[PDB]
Amino acid sequence: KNIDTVREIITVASILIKFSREDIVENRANFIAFLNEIGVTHEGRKLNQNSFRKIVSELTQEDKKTLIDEFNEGFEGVYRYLEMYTNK
DNA sequence: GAAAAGAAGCTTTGCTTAATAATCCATATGGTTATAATGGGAGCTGTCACGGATGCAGG
Predict the structure, then answer these.
(1) Is the minimum distance from the CB of A57 to strand B below 7 Å?
(2) How far apart, in whole angstroms, are the C-alpha atoms of residue A32 and residue A63?
(3) Buried/exposed code over A59-70 (b: 16+ C-beta within 10 A; e: otherwise)
(4) What's the CA–C1' distance between A55 and B29, in Å?
(5) CA of A5 to C1' of B50 (A)
(6) Which residues have C-beta within 8 Å of that of residue A60, sequence separation ≥ 6?
(7) CB neighbours of A56 closer than 8 A, spacing ≥ 6?
């Protein structure tokens, strides 16, 4: 379904903020322009801000859990250091 | 083949918020006090065994 399109969204976000290029995620319209030029596609077309908030909105809680769990896999070296000093 | 229906793509719009005028207030700094006002205080008090460096002295 659309869940796979969201998977490529967060994966491109993972590469994007992983390679020290941050400022293009927090602003939204330029980010959607970036996603449209790299050629992601939900239902045969480009991405609208309404369409973006729908596809983020129309979404299941367990799938969201799956997406953040998949997202945390690249950022493992940060989290091991993060929790090694919090084992109280 | 019609017709409701929902998205694509424009707009607004009530709300927010970051930039910036205004103001006030901590802060520094200095001055200025004209009778006279003339040597401190805890110091521990019940180690101790060695040891080397002064220290003093007579031959």
Answers:
(1) no
(2) 22
(3) eeeeeeeebeee
(4) 65
(5) 86
(6) A3
(7) A6
**Cβ of A45 less than 7 A from strand B:** yes
Stated in angstroms to one decimal place, the resolution of this structure is: 3.8
How many CB atoms within 10 Å of residue A40?
15
Q: Is the CB of A46 under 7 A from strand B?
A: yes
A51 touches strand B (CB under 7 A): yes
The DSSP call for residue A60 is -
Structure tokens at A27: 């602003």
> Which bases on strand B have an atom closer than 7 Å to a protein beta carbon?
7-10
Q: What are the residue boundaries of the structural domains of chain A, listed by start?
A: 1-88
Which fold is adopted by the domain A1-88? Anti-sigma factor AsiA (1.10.1810)
| Method for this entry | cryo-EM
